[PDB]
């Protein structure tokens, strides 16, 4: 009852909700160079997105 | 025999974020703990000391929530509403 | 944040209830039967 | 040149992990460690002296070593058989004589080996050699399973060698091998392997053969820009499987192995030269011996003698077996491919 059909064809992707860790290389100790931490992490958490 | 005390033990693992230090900013490295009797000799005859009025941290460290189950739903507007509100709803931990 | 994981739980019992609020809709067409086969009796007969 | 398959055409260029491996230590940074915190003619000689800088802008590959000898014709002819066959260098037979008088058990003819070895050398003139192995394969023709492509290996042999009588030459030398298992001094304690051809150079009476004494086979540029490959050919006679009579039939390496049998009987002496191809270690390889070859256990100290001789890398080993032209004699050929020579010591007897 039919000849041609409609398919898709794009494969699909996945949502990357991950467990998200940091090695940072770090020049001096101090609360800017630790929160540097911190704050690596809200960029890396911020790629995700 | 002091020398003793402070050389048996490995040094920690963590790094925290606020140290207690000096008034100049040394650091400072362990801890002893004794009565008032012995401790009070030393200070005396033994050892010396080379600073009274230390730093202190005040507020505690705290914690982020890193990764989760995503878990969601939906009263069905397309089919891939259901992704765009994952993205709304992980937009908000950060 | 505490708020946050509230509209996840209480949202997930809107789930659990309608699914046991459902239970009663289906219990109207099974003890719709089990009368109706009491109250006839076979064509044999 | 730069193709657009790039992923592979750079791949056999030789990476991205070379290119990445030099990213961190030296395309970044300033750190490793810092501080804290001529009209025809030129231009075609003109771009081979640009190809000599393209020789030297730029230089897998695997490594050979390659031997030469100086050899004389007698025994072997390298033009009449092709690049592919193998070789078999000897000791100097000053020494057959001496050694037959010490190495023959008592009541044995030592005079034997002298005179077989000395008849030789007024047949072939009608100087430690080379043996090619063709020419060995007619010569103990006489002891074979198969007889009628040994046979093949004779037709081709009394036509095509360089000679006066190549057939004097070959029952001579089977004459020389009887009196060498008689004698007891065994052809492996003389026979010693020398790697398979690619080229030789021709000269009257003697010939400068180039082979490959440890290697792989078919990427030696021969010197034909053409063709630099060529396939190691055996002869059906001497090619035997254990795979195939002990139902191995699993995939994996395939070694190669040269194989002697004696019989050891008064004045009725076999010789028969196998290659050997298996999936067996050579120390798991004297127990096959056992279960094949019984019969000229009785009739002689051992019966077998061998050696390696080559390994085939390939997963599943393929083989060819196919009837060839040695000028205009069809032979069933045996022909191997894909050979990794390395060459081995032989094994003992007495």
Request: charged fraction near 20%; glycine fraction near 6%; charge should be neutral.
């Amino acid at each position: 009852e039919d000849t041609e059909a409609d398919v898709p064809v794009t494969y699909g992707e996945m949502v990357l909700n991950g467990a998200n860790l940091v090695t940072a290389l770090v020049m001096g100790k101090a609360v800017r160079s630790l929160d540097d931490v911190g704050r690596h992490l809200l960029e890396m958490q911020e790629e995700q997105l | 025999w002091l020398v003793d005390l402070t050389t048996a033990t490995q040094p920690s693992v963590a790094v925290p974020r606020l140290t207690h230090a000096d008034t100049r900013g040394r650091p400072v490295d362990g801890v002893l703990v004794t009565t008032a009797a012995i401790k009070q000799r030393l200070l005396q005859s033994f050892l010396k000391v080379e600073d009274t009025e230390a730093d202190v941290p005040v507020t505690y460290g705290e914690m982020v929530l890193n990764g989760a189950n995503l878990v969601t739903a939906l009263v069905m507007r397309s089919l891939d509403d259901v992704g765009r509100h994952l993205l709304e709803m992980q937009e908000e931990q950060l | 944040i505490s708020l946050h994981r509230q509209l996840r739980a209480i949202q997930q019992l809107a789930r659990n209830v309608q699914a046991v609020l459902g239970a009663f809709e289906r219990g109207t067409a099974d003890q719709m039967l089990h009368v109706l086969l009491e109250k006839a009796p076979p064509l044999a007969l | 040149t730069k193709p657009l398959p790039t992923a592979p055409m750079a791949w056999a260029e030789s990476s991205p992990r070379e290119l990445a491996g030099h990213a961190p230590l030296r395309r970044v940074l300033r750190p490793p460690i810092a501080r804290r915190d001529t009209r025809a003619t030129r231009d075609d000689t003109e771009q081979a002296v640009d190809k000599i800088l393209r020789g030297a802008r730029r230089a897998g590959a695997p490594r050979y070593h390659l031997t030469r000898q100086v050899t004389l014709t007698d025994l072997c002819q390298p033009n009449a058989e092709r690049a592919g066959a193998l070789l078999l260098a000897l000791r100097h037979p000053t020494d057959l004589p001496h050694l037959a008088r010490h190495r023959a058990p008592p009541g044995r003819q030592t005079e034997r080996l002298a005179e077989a070895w000395g008849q030789l050398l007024e047949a072939s003139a009608l100087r430690a050699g080379l043996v090619s192995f063709n020419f060995l394969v007619a010569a103990c023709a006489a002891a074979y399973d198969a007889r009628d492509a040994a046979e093949a290996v004779r037709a081709h042999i009394t036509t095509n060698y360089g000679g006066t009588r190549a057939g004097a030459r070959l029952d001579r030398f089977s004459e020389c091998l009887r009196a060498m298992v008689h004698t007891h001094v065994f052809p492996h304690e003389v026979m010693r392997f020398f790697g398979g051809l690619v080229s030789w150079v021709t000269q009257d009476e003697l010939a400068s053969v180039t082979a490959v004494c440890s290697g792989p086979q078919e990427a030696t540029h021969t010197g034909h820009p053409g063709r630099p490959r060529s396939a190691v050919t055996i002869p059906a006679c001497a090619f035997v499987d254990l795979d195939a009579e002990l139902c191995l039939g699993g995939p994996g390496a395939a070694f190669l192995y040269l194989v002697f049998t004696y019989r050891q009987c008064r004045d009725q002496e076999l010789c028969c030269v196998y290659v050997v191809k298996s999936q067996l270690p050579p120390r798991g390889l004297e127990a096959a011996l056992e279960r094949l070859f019984g019969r000229l256990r009785i009739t002689n100290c051992t019966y077998a003698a061998f050696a390696e001789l080559g390994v085939m890398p390939d997963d599943s080993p393929r083989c060819l077996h196919r009837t060839e032209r040695f000028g205009a004699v069809g032979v069933p050929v045996v022909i191997l491919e894909g050979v990794v020579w390395r060459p081995g010591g032989w094994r003992a007897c007495a």
